[PDB]
PDB file of all heavy atoms in Angstrom:
ATOM      1  N   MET A  27       0.861  -1.172   0.000  1.00  0.00           N
ATOM      2  CA  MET A  27       0.000   0.000   0.000  1.00  0.00           C
ATOM      3  C   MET A  27       0.899   1.225   0.000  1.00  0.00           C
ATOM      4  O   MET A  27       2.075   1.138   0.353  1.00  0.00           O
ATOM      5  CB  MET A  27      -0.924   0.056   1.233  1.00  0.00           C
ATOM      6  CG  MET A  27      -1.741  -1.187   1.452  1.00  0.00           C
ATOM      7  SD  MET A  27      -2.648  -1.020   3.042  1.00  0.00           S
ATOM      8  CE  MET A  27      -1.341  -0.390   4.125  1.00  0.00           C
ATOM      9  N   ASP A  28       0.346   2.371  -0.389  1.00  0.00           N
ATOM     10  CA  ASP A  28       1.145   3.593  -0.363  1.00  0.00           C
ATOM     11  C   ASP A  28       1.080   4.231   1.017  1.00  0.00           C
ATOM     12  O   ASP A  28       0.325   3.808   1.888  1.00  0.00           O
ATOM     13  CB  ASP A  28       0.667   4.590  -1.415  1.00  0.00           C
ATOM     14  CG  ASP A  28      -0.824   4.774  -1.387  1.00  0.00           C
ATOM     15  OD1 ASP A  28      -1.532   3.904  -1.930  1.00  0.00           O
ATOM     16  OD2 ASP A  28      -1.290   5.761  -0.797  1.00  0.00           O
ATOM     17  N   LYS A  29       1.892   5.274   1.205  1.00  0.00           N
ATOM     18  CA  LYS A  29       1.962   5.949   2.498  1.00  0.00           C
ATOM     19  C   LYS A  29       0.609   6.517   2.910  1.00  0.00           C
ATOM     20  O   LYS A  29       0.208   6.405   4.074  1.00  0.00           O
ATOM     21  CB  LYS A  29       3.017   7.056   2.442  1.00  0.00           C
ATOM     22  CG  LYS A  29       3.497   7.532   3.783  1.00  0.00           C
ATOM     23  CD  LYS A  29       4.592   8.567   3.640  1.00  0.00           C
ATOM     24  CE  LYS A  29       5.349   8.745   4.947  1.00  0.00           C
ATOM     25  NZ  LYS A  29       6.688   9.375   4.729  1.00  0.00           N
ATOM     26  N   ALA A  30      -0.113   7.124   1.966  1.00  0.00           N
ATOM     27  CA  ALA A  30      -1.415   7.711   2.274  1.00  0.00           C
ATOM     28  C   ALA A  30      -2.361   6.670   2.855  1.00  0.00           C
ATOM     29  O   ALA A  30      -2.963   6.878   3.916  1.00  0.00           O
ATOM     30  CB  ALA A  30      -2.019   8.342   1.016  1.00  0.00           C
ATOM     31  N   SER A  31      -2.516   5.547   2.156  1.00  0.00           N
ATOM     32  CA  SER A  31      -3.313   4.443   2.675  1.00  0.00           C
ATOM     33  C   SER A  31      -2.771   3.963   4.018  1.00  0.00           C
ATOM     34  O   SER A  31      -3.537   3.764   4.969  1.00  0.00           O
ATOM     35  CB  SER A  31      -3.320   3.309   1.656  1.00  0.00           C
ATOM     36  OG  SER A  31      -3.885   3.753   0.442  1.00  0.00           O
ATOM     37  N   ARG A  32      -1.445   3.784   4.119  1.00  0.00           N
ATOM     38  CA  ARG A  32      -0.845   3.366   5.387  1.00  0.00           C
ATOM     39  C   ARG A  32      -1.212   4.314   6.514  1.00  0.00           C
ATOM     40  O   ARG A  32      -1.278   3.899   7.676  1.00  0.00           O
ATOM     41  CB  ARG A  32       0.679   3.277   5.270  1.00  0.00           C
ATOM     42  CG  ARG A  32       1.228   1.863   5.210  1.00  0.00           C
ATOM     43  CD  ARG A  32       2.410   1.773   4.285  1.00  0.00           C
ATOM     44  NE  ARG A  32       3.408   2.780   4.610  1.00  0.00           N
ATOM     45  CZ  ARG A  32       4.195   3.365   3.711  1.00  0.00           C
ATOM     46  NH1 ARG A  32       4.097   3.043   2.421  1.00  0.00           N
ATOM     47  NH2 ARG A  32       5.071   4.277   4.098  1.00  0.00           N
ATOM     48  N   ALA A  33      -1.480   5.578   6.180  1.00  0.00           N
ATOM     49  CA  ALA A  33      -1.721   6.612   7.179  1.00  0.00           C
ATOM     50  C   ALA A  33      -3.138   6.548   7.719  1.00  0.00           C
ATOM     51  O   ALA A  33      -3.344   6.532   8.937  1.00  0.00           O
ATOM     52  CB  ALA A  33      -1.443   7.992   6.579  1.00  0.00           C
ATOM     53  N   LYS A  34      -4.130   6.525   6.824  1.00  0.00           N
ATOM     54  CA  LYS A  34      -5.518   6.394   7.254  1.00  0.00           C
ATOM     55  C   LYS A  34      -5.704   5.198   8.176  1.00  0.00           C
ATOM     56  O   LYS A  34      -6.544   5.233   9.082  1.00  0.00           O
ATOM     57  CB  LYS A  34      -6.440   6.273   6.035  1.00  0.00           C
ATOM     58  CG  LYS A  34      -6.126   7.275   4.922  1.00  0.00           C
ATOM     59  CD  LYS A  34      -7.205   7.303   3.846  1.00  0.00           C
ATOM     60  CE  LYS A  34      -6.728   8.052   2.595  1.00  0.00           C
ATOM     61  NZ  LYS A  34      -7.801   8.080   1.550  1.00  0.00           N
ATOM     62  N   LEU A  35      -4.933   4.140   7.968  1.00  0.00           N
ATOM     63  CA  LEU A  35      -5.028   2.942   8.785  1.00  0.00           C
ATOM     64  C   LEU A  35      -4.208   3.033  10.060  1.00  0.00           C
ATOM     65  O   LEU A  35      -4.372   2.192  10.953  1.00  0.00           O
ATOM     66  CB  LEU A  35      -4.589   1.719   7.980  1.00  0.00           C
ATOM     67  CG  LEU A  35      -5.659   1.090   7.080  1.00  0.00           C
ATOM     68  CD1 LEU A  35      -5.170  -0.237   6.612  1.00  0.00           C
ATOM     69  CD2 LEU A  35      -6.953   0.919   7.855  1.00  0.00           C
ATOM     70  N   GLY A  36      -3.338   4.030  10.169  1.00  0.00           N
ATOM     71  CA  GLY A  36      -2.454   4.084  11.314  1.00  0.00           C
ATOM     72  C   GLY A  36      -1.539   2.889  11.360  1.00  0.00           C
ATOM     73  O   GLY A  36      -1.247   2.370  12.446  1.00  0.00           O
ATOM     74  N   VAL A  37      -1.089   2.421  10.198  1.00  0.00           N
ATOM     75  CA  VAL A  37      -0.115   1.343  10.123  1.00  0.00           C
ATOM     76  C   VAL A  37       1.178   1.887   9.543  1.00  0.00           C
ATOM     77  O   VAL A  37       1.197   2.786   8.694  1.00  0.00           O
ATOM     78  CB  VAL A  37      -0.596   0.141   9.286  1.00  0.00           C
ATOM     79  CG1 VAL A  37      -1.881  -0.397   9.852  1.00  0.00           C
ATOM     80  CG2 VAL A  37      -0.780   0.557   7.852  1.00  0.00           C
ATOM     81  N   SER A  38       2.267   1.331  10.029  1.00  0.00           N
ATOM     82  CA  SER A  38       3.577   1.499   9.451  1.00  0.00           C
ATOM     83  C   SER A  38       3.924   0.197   8.756  1.00  0.00           C
ATOM     84  O   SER A  38       3.219  -0.808   8.887  1.00  0.00           O
ATOM     85  CB  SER A  38       4.603   1.852  10.535  1.00  0.00           C
ATOM     86  OG  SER A  38       4.009   2.692  11.520  1.00  0.00           O
ATOM     87  N   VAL A  39       5.006   0.229   7.993  1.00  0.00           N
ATOM     88  CA  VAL A  39       5.465  -0.974   7.320  1.00  0.00           C
ATOM     89  C   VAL A  39       5.894  -1.991   8.372  1.00  0.00           C
ATOM     90  O   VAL A  39       6.381  -1.632   9.456  1.00  0.00           O
ATOM     91  CB  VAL A  39       6.595  -0.616   6.338  1.00  0.00           C
ATOM     92  CG1 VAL A  39       7.229  -1.839   5.735  1.00  0.00           C
ATOM     93  CG2 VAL A  39       6.050   0.311   5.248  1.00  0.00           C
ATOM     94  N   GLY A  40       5.650  -3.274   8.083  1.00  0.00           N
ATOM     95  CA  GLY A  40       5.867  -4.339   9.036  1.00  0.00           C
ATOM     96  C   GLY A  40       4.662  -4.699   9.883  1.00  0.00           C
ATOM     97  O   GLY A  40       4.609  -5.812  10.413  1.00  0.00           O
ATOM     98  N   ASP A  41       3.689  -3.797  10.023  1.00  0.00           N
ATOM     99  CA  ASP A  41       2.470  -4.103  10.760  1.00  0.00           C
ATOM    100  C   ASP A  41       1.609  -5.094   9.978  1.00  0.00           C
ATOM    101  O   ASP A  41       1.839  -5.367   8.795  1.00  0.00           O
ATOM    102  CB  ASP A  41       1.665  -2.832  11.022  1.00  0.00           C
ATOM    103  CG  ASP A  41       2.253  -1.973  12.130  1.00  0.00           C
ATOM    104  OD1 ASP A  41       3.072  -2.487  12.932  1.00  0.00           O
ATOM    105  OD2 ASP A  41       1.878  -0.775  12.193  1.00  0.00           O
ATOM    106  N   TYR A  42       0.580  -5.620  10.638  1.00  0.00           N
ATOM    107  CA  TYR A  42      -0.330  -6.551   9.992  1.00  0.00           C
ATOM    108  C   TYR A  42      -1.676  -5.886   9.764  1.00  0.00           C
ATOM    109  O   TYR A  42      -2.116  -5.051  10.555  1.00  0.00           O
ATOM    110  CB  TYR A  42      -0.498  -7.834  10.809  1.00  0.00           C
ATOM    111  CG  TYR A  42       0.758  -8.662  10.801  1.00  0.00           C
ATOM    112  CD1 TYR A  42       1.711  -8.516  11.795  1.00  0.00           C
ATOM    113  CD2 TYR A  42       1.020  -9.557   9.769  1.00  0.00           C
ATOM    114  CE1 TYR A  42       2.876  -9.263  11.773  1.00  0.00           C
ATOM    115  CE2 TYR A  42       2.193 -10.301   9.735  1.00  0.00           C
ATOM    116  CZ  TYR A  42       3.111 -10.150  10.742  1.00  0.00           C
ATOM    117  OH  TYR A  42       4.274 -10.884  10.726  1.00  0.00           O
ATOM    118  N   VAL A  43      -2.310  -6.240   8.655  1.00  0.00           N
ATOM    119  CA  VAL A  43      -3.646  -5.754   8.350  1.00  0.00           C
ATOM    120  C   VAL A  43      -4.550  -6.937   8.057  1.00  0.00           C
ATOM    121  O   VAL A  43      -4.101  -7.998   7.612  1.00  0.00           O
ATOM    122  CB  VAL A  43      -3.683  -4.773   7.172  1.00  0.00           C
ATOM    123  CG1 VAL A  43      -3.016  -3.455   7.571  1.00  0.00           C
ATOM    124  CG2 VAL A  43      -3.049  -5.401   5.914  1.00  0.00           C
ATOM    125  N   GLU A  44      -5.820  -6.756   8.378  1.00  0.00           N
ATOM    126  CA  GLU A  44      -6.893  -7.610   7.915  1.00  0.00           C
ATOM    127  C   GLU A  44      -7.380  -7.065   6.585  1.00  0.00           C
ATOM    128  O   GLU A  44      -7.647  -5.867   6.461  1.00  0.00           O
ATOM    129  CB  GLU A  44      -8.050  -7.616   8.913  1.00  0.00           C
ATOM    130  CG  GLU A  44      -9.365  -8.129   8.310  1.00  0.00           C
ATOM    131  CD  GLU A  44     -10.593  -7.864   9.170  1.00  0.00           C
ATOM    132  OE1 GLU A  44     -10.904  -8.717  10.028  1.00  0.00           O
ATOM    133  OE2 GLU A  44     -11.263  -6.820   8.971  1.00  0.00           O
ATOM    134  N   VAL A  45      -7.478  -7.930   5.592  1.00  0.00           N
ATOM    135  CA  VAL A  45      -8.086  -7.596   4.315  1.00  0.00           C
ATOM    136  C   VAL A  45      -9.361  -8.415   4.215  1.00  0.00           C
ATOM    137  O   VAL A  45      -9.336  -9.626   4.462  1.00  0.00           O
ATOM    138  CB  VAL A  45      -7.118  -7.880   3.154  1.00  0.00           C
ATOM    139  CG1 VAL A  45      -7.699  -7.398   1.853  1.00  0.00           C
ATOM    140  CG2 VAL A  45      -5.756  -7.188   3.431  1.00  0.00           C
ATOM    141  N   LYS A  46     -10.479  -7.761   3.885  1.00  0.00           N
ATOM    142  CA  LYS A  46     -11.771  -8.405   4.064  1.00  0.00           C
ATOM    143  C   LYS A  46     -12.742  -8.080   2.941  1.00  0.00           C
ATOM    144  O   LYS A  46     -12.833  -6.937   2.491  1.00  0.00           O
ATOM    145  CB  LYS A  46     -12.413  -8.020   5.409  1.00  0.00           C
ATOM    146  CG  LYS A  46     -13.927  -8.328   5.457  1.00  0.00           C
ATOM    147  CD  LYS A  46     -14.381  -8.936   6.755  1.00  0.00           C
ATOM    148  CE  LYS A  46     -14.933  -7.890   7.681  1.00  0.00           C
ATOM    149  NZ  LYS A  46     -16.066  -8.461   8.489  1.00  0.00           N
ATOM    150  N   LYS A  47     -13.449  -9.117   2.488  1.00  0.00           N
ATOM    151  CA  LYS A  47     -14.642  -9.030   1.639  1.00  0.00           C
ATOM    152  C   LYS A  47     -15.498 -10.228   2.058  1.00  0.00           C
ATOM    153  O   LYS A  47     -15.365 -11.320   1.503  1.00  0.00           O
ATOM    154  CB  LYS A  47     -14.293  -9.061   0.156  1.00  0.00           C
ATOM    155  CG  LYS A  47     -15.486  -9.313  -0.763  1.00  0.00           C
ATOM    156  CD  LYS A  47     -15.788  -8.089  -1.585  1.00  0.00           C
ATOM    157  CE  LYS A  47     -17.074  -8.276  -2.383  1.00  0.00           C
ATOM    158  NZ  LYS A  47     -16.803  -8.551  -3.811  1.00  0.00           N
ATOM    159  N   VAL A  48     -16.355 -10.000   3.060  1.00  0.00           N
ATOM    160  CA  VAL A  48     -16.981 -10.976   3.961  1.00  0.00           C
ATOM    161  C   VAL A  48     -15.969 -11.965   4.545  1.00  0.00           C
ATOM    162  O   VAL A  48     -15.859 -12.086   5.774  1.00  0.00           O
ATOM    163  CB  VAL A  48     -18.177 -11.723   3.323  1.00  0.00           C
ATOM    164  CG1 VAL A  48     -17.797 -12.563   2.164  1.00  0.00           C
ATOM    165  CG2 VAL A  48     -18.862 -12.597   4.379  1.00  0.00           C
ATOM    166  N   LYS A  49     -15.272 -12.714   3.689  1.00  0.00           N
ATOM    167  CA  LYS A  49     -14.126 -13.491   4.126  1.00  0.00           C
ATOM    168  C   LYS A  49     -12.987 -12.535   4.441  1.00  0.00           C
ATOM    169  O   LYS A  49     -13.003 -11.374   4.037  1.00  0.00           O
ATOM    170  CB  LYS A  49     -13.691 -14.479   3.052  1.00  0.00           C
ATOM    171  CG  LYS A  49     -14.518 -15.745   2.915  1.00  0.00           C
ATOM    172  CD  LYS A  49     -14.320 -16.292   1.507  1.00  0.00           C
ATOM    173  CE  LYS A  49     -13.790 -17.733   1.500  1.00  0.00           C
ATOM    174  NZ  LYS A  49     -12.844 -18.031   0.346  1.00  0.00           N
ATOM    175  N   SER A  50     -11.981 -13.023   5.161  1.00  0.00           N
ATOM    176  CA  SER A  50     -10.865 -12.143   5.487  1.00  0.00           C
ATOM    177  C   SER A  50      -9.577 -12.939   5.630  1.00  0.00           C
ATOM    178  O   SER A  50      -9.584 -14.103   6.049  1.00  0.00           O
ATOM    179  CB  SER A  50     -11.107 -11.358   6.782  1.00  0.00           C
ATOM    180  OG  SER A  50     -10.742 -12.153   7.879  1.00  0.00           O
ATOM    181  N   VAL A  51      -8.470 -12.287   5.268  1.00  0.00           N
ATOM    182  CA  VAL A  51      -7.118 -12.798   5.432  1.00  0.00           C
ATOM    183  C   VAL A  51      -6.311 -11.717   6.139  1.00  0.00           C
ATOM    184  O   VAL A  51      -6.663 -10.539   6.123  1.00  0.00           O
ATOM    185  CB  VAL A  51      -6.454 -13.169   4.083  1.00  0.00           C
ATOM    186  CG1 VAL A  51      -7.297 -14.176   3.328  1.00  0.00           C
ATOM    187  CG2 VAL A  51      -6.242 -11.919   3.235  1.00  0.00           C
ATOM    188  N   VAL A  52      -5.206 -12.115   6.740  1.00  0.00           N
ATOM    189  CA  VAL A  52      -4.293 -11.153   7.345  1.00  0.00           C
ATOM    190  C   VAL A  52      -2.990 -11.171   6.564  1.00  0.00           C
ATOM    191  O   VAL A  52      -2.550 -12.224   6.081  1.00  0.00           O
ATOM    192  CB  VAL A  52      -4.060 -11.432   8.844  1.00  0.00           C
ATOM    193  CG1 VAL A  52      -5.400 -11.651   9.548  1.00  0.00           C
ATOM    194  CG2 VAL A  52      -3.162 -12.615   9.048  1.00  0.00           C
ATOM    195  N   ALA A  53      -2.375  -9.998   6.432  1.00  0.00           N
ATOM    196  CA  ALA A  53      -1.141  -9.865   5.671  1.00  0.00           C
ATOM    197  C   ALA A  53      -0.263  -8.783   6.295  1.00  0.00           C
ATOM    198  O   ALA A  53      -0.751  -7.888   6.984  1.00  0.00           O
ATOM    199  CB  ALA A  53      -1.436  -9.547   4.201  1.00  0.00           C
ATOM    200  N   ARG A  54       1.039  -8.864   6.026  1.00  0.00           N
ATOM    201  CA  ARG A  54       1.994  -7.867   6.496  1.00  0.00           C
ATOM    202  C   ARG A  54       2.053  -6.680   5.538  1.00  0.00           C
ATOM    203  O   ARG A  54       2.145  -6.858   4.317  1.00  0.00           O
ATOM    204  CB  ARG A  54       3.392  -8.468   6.657  1.00  0.00           C
ATOM    205  CG  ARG A  54       4.344  -7.530   7.365  1.00  0.00           C
ATOM    206  CD  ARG A  54       5.606  -8.246   7.874  1.00  0.00           C
ATOM    207  NE  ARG A  54       6.534  -8.651   6.808  1.00  0.00           N
ATOM    208  CZ  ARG A  54       7.770  -8.160   6.656  1.00  0.00           C
ATOM    209  NH1 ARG A  54       8.231  -7.205   7.473  1.00  0.00           N
ATOM    210  NH2 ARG A  54       8.549  -8.591   5.664  1.00  0.00           N
ATOM    211  N   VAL A  55       2.030  -5.470   6.100  1.00  0.00           N
ATOM    212  CA  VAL A  55       2.101  -4.261   5.287  1.00  0.00           C
ATOM    213  C   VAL A  55       3.508  -4.094   4.726  1.00  0.00           C
ATOM    214  O   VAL A  55       4.510  -4.255   5.441  1.00  0.00           O
ATOM    215  CB  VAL A  55       1.708  -3.022   6.109  1.00  0.00           C
ATOM    216  CG1 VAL A  55       1.797  -1.760   5.237  1.00  0.00           C
ATOM    217  CG2 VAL A  55       0.331  -3.182   6.684  1.00  0.00           C
ATOM    218  N   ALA A  56       3.587  -3.748   3.442  1.00  0.00           N
ATOM    219  CA  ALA A  56       4.833  -3.348   2.810  1.00  0.00           C
ATOM    220  C   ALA A  56       4.595  -2.100   1.973  1.00  0.00           C
ATOM    221  O   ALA A  56       3.457  -1.661   1.768  1.00  0.00           O
ATOM    222  CB  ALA A  56       5.423  -4.459   1.948  1.00  0.00           C
ATOM    223  N   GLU A  57       5.699  -1.537   1.494  1.00  0.00           N
ATOM    224  CA  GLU A  57       5.679  -0.271   0.785  1.00  0.00           C
ATOM    225  C   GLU A  57       5.231  -0.458  -0.652  1.00  0.00           C
ATOM    226  O   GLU A  57       5.654  -1.397  -1.327  1.00  0.00           O
ATOM    227  CB  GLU A  57       7.073   0.346   0.769  1.00  0.00           C
ATOM    228  CG  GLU A  57       7.289   1.444   1.734  1.00  0.00           C
ATOM    229  CD  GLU A  57       8.532   2.208   1.390  1.00  0.00           C
ATOM    230  OE1 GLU A  57       9.600   1.572   1.258  1.00  0.00           O
ATOM    231  OE2 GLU A  57       8.428   3.440   1.235  1.00  0.00           O
ATOM    232  N   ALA A  58       4.416   0.476  -1.131  1.00  0.00           N
ATOM    233  CA  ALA A  58       4.124   0.556  -2.551  1.00  0.00           C
ATOM    234  C   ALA A  58       5.347   1.049  -3.313  1.00  0.00           C
ATOM    235  O   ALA A  58       6.195   1.760  -2.773  1.00  0.00           O
ATOM    236  CB  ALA A  58       2.946   1.493  -2.803  1.00  0.00           C
ATOM    237  N   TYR A  59       5.434   0.649  -4.583  1.00  0.00           N
ATOM    238  CA  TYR A  59       6.406   1.184  -5.524  1.00  0.00           C
ATOM    239  C   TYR A  59       6.011   2.596  -5.945  1.00  0.00           C
ATOM    240  O   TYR A  59       4.825   2.916  -6.001  1.00  0.00           O
ATOM    241  CB  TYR A  59       6.492   0.286  -6.756  1.00  0.00           C
ATOM    242  CG  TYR A  59       7.294  -0.970  -6.524  1.00  0.00           C
ATOM    243  CD1 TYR A  59       6.796  -2.005  -5.736  1.00  0.00           C
ATOM    244  CD2 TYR A  59       8.543  -1.129  -7.095  1.00  0.00           C
ATOM    245  CE1 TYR A  59       7.524  -3.165  -5.530  1.00  0.00           C
ATOM    246  CE2 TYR A  59       9.278  -2.277  -6.907  1.00  0.00           C
ATOM    247  CZ  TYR A  59       8.769  -3.293  -6.120  1.00  0.00           C
ATOM    248  OH  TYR A  59       9.515  -4.423  -5.915  1.00  0.00           O
ATOM    249  N   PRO A  60       6.983   3.453  -6.261  1.00  0.00           N
ATOM    250  CA  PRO A  60       6.635   4.816  -6.696  1.00  0.00           C
ATOM    251  C   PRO A  60       5.637   4.852  -7.841  1.00  0.00           C
ATOM    252  O   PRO A  60       4.756   5.721  -7.872  1.00  0.00           O
ATOM    253  CB  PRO A  60       7.994   5.414  -7.101  1.00  0.00           C
ATOM    254  CG  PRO A  60       8.916   4.266  -7.208  1.00  0.00           C
ATOM    255  CD  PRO A  60       8.437   3.244  -6.238  1.00  0.00           C
ATOM    256  N   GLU A  61       5.741   3.908  -8.773  1.00  0.00           N
ATOM    257  CA  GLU A  61       4.784   3.828  -9.863  1.00  0.00           C
ATOM    258  C   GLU A  61       3.371   3.530  -9.370  1.00  0.00           C
ATOM    259  O   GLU A  61       2.407   3.784 -10.094  1.00  0.00           O
ATOM    260  CB  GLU A  61       5.255   2.768 -10.859  1.00  0.00           C
ATOM    261  CG  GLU A  61       6.573   3.130 -11.552  1.00  0.00           C
ATOM    262  CD  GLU A  61       7.800   2.650 -10.776  1.00  0.00           C
ATOM    263  OE1 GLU A  61       7.616   2.072  -9.679  1.00  0.00           O
ATOM    264  OE2 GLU A  61       8.945   2.862 -11.253  1.00  0.00           O
ATOM    265  N   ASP A  62       3.219   3.026  -8.147  1.00  0.00           N
ATOM    266  CA  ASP A  62       1.902   2.686  -7.624  1.00  0.00           C
ATOM    267  C   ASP A  62       1.360   3.682  -6.603  1.00  0.00           C
ATOM    268  O   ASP A  62       0.186   3.576  -6.235  1.00  0.00           O
ATOM    269  CB  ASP A  62       1.923   1.272  -7.009  1.00  0.00           C
ATOM    270  CG  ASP A  62       2.069   0.172  -8.066  1.00  0.00           C
ATOM    271  OD1 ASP A  62       1.362   0.249  -9.097  1.00  0.00           O
ATOM    272  OD2 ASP A  62       2.877  -0.773  -7.872  1.00  0.00           O
ATOM    273  N   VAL A  63       2.159   4.661  -6.162  1.00  0.00           N
ATOM    274  CA  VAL A  63       1.657   5.674  -5.235  1.00  0.00           C
ATOM    275  C   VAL A  63       0.462   6.394  -5.852  1.00  0.00           C
ATOM    276  O   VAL A  63       0.480   6.779  -7.028  1.00  0.00           O
ATOM    277  CB  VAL A  63       2.782   6.652  -4.859  1.00  0.00           C
ATOM    278  CG1 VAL A  63       2.248   7.837  -4.068  1.00  0.00           C
ATOM    279  CG2 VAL A  63       3.854   5.934  -4.058  1.00  0.00           C
ATOM    280  N   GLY A  64      -0.603   6.550  -5.064  1.00  0.00           N
ATOM    281  CA  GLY A  64      -1.784   7.259  -5.496  1.00  0.00           C
ATOM    282  C   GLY A  64      -2.837   6.416  -6.190  1.00  0.00           C
ATOM    283  O   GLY A  64      -4.001   6.822  -6.226  1.00  0.00           O
ATOM    284  N   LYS A  65      -2.476   5.249  -6.718  1.00  0.00           N
ATOM    285  CA  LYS A  65      -3.408   4.472  -7.532  1.00  0.00           C
ATOM    286  C   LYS A  65      -4.592   3.908  -6.749  1.00  0.00           C
ATOM    287  O   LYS A  65      -5.529   3.396  -7.374  1.00  0.00           O
ATOM    288  CB  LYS A  65      -2.675   3.321  -8.217  1.00  0.00           C
ATOM    289  CG  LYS A  65      -1.718   3.749  -9.330  1.00  0.00           C
ATOM    290  CD  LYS A  65      -0.991   2.548  -9.909  1.00  0.00           C
ATOM    291  CE  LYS A  65      -0.484   2.798 -11.328  1.00  0.00           C
ATOM    292  NZ  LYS A  65       0.483   1.731 -11.718  1.00  0.00           N
ATOM    293  N   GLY A  66      -4.588   3.983  -5.421  1.00  0.00           N
ATOM    294  CA  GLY A  66      -5.680   3.410  -4.651  1.00  0.00           C
ATOM    295  C   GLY A  66      -5.773   1.903  -4.745  1.00  0.00           C
ATOM    296  O   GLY A  66      -6.882   1.351  -4.750  1.00  0.00           O
ATOM    297  N   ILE A  67      -4.637   1.220  -4.852  1.00  0.00           N
ATOM    298  CA  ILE A  67      -4.612  -0.225  -5.020  1.00  0.00           C
ATOM    299  C   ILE A  67      -3.946  -0.835  -3.801  1.00  0.00           C
ATOM    300  O   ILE A  67      -3.267  -0.163  -3.025  1.00  0.00           O
ATOM    301  CB  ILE A  67      -3.880  -0.672  -6.304  1.00  0.00           C
ATOM    302  CG1 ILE A  67      -2.456  -0.117  -6.316  1.00  0.00           C
ATOM    303  CG2 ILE A  67      -4.701  -0.316  -7.562  1.00  0.00           C
ATOM    304  CD1 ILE A  67      -1.598  -0.660  -7.421  1.00  0.00           C
TER     305      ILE A  67
END
């Protein structure tokens, strides 16, 4: 994820997030590539 997204969540890199669409998985946060900053992905 990018820094902006990381911010709204109050996560830094290395933290864990739940990703959910009724079902859910947990994953470790890492940095977006510069080409991906802003894309909302």
Side-chain angles (χ1 to χ4, degrees):
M27 307 174 315
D28 48 281
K29 198 177 197 160
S31 300
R32 254 144 52 212
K34 315 190 193 180
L35 277 192
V37 302
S38 324
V39 173
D41 284 342
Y42 291 92
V43 291
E44 162 193 272
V45 186
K46 163 138 96 145
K47 166 112 187 256
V48 64
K49 282 157 123 214
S50 84
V51 304
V52 312
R54 190 164 72 115
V55 180
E57 258 195 306
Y59 282 72
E61 295 89 358
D62 290 315
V63 171
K65 290 177 157 167
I67 56 171

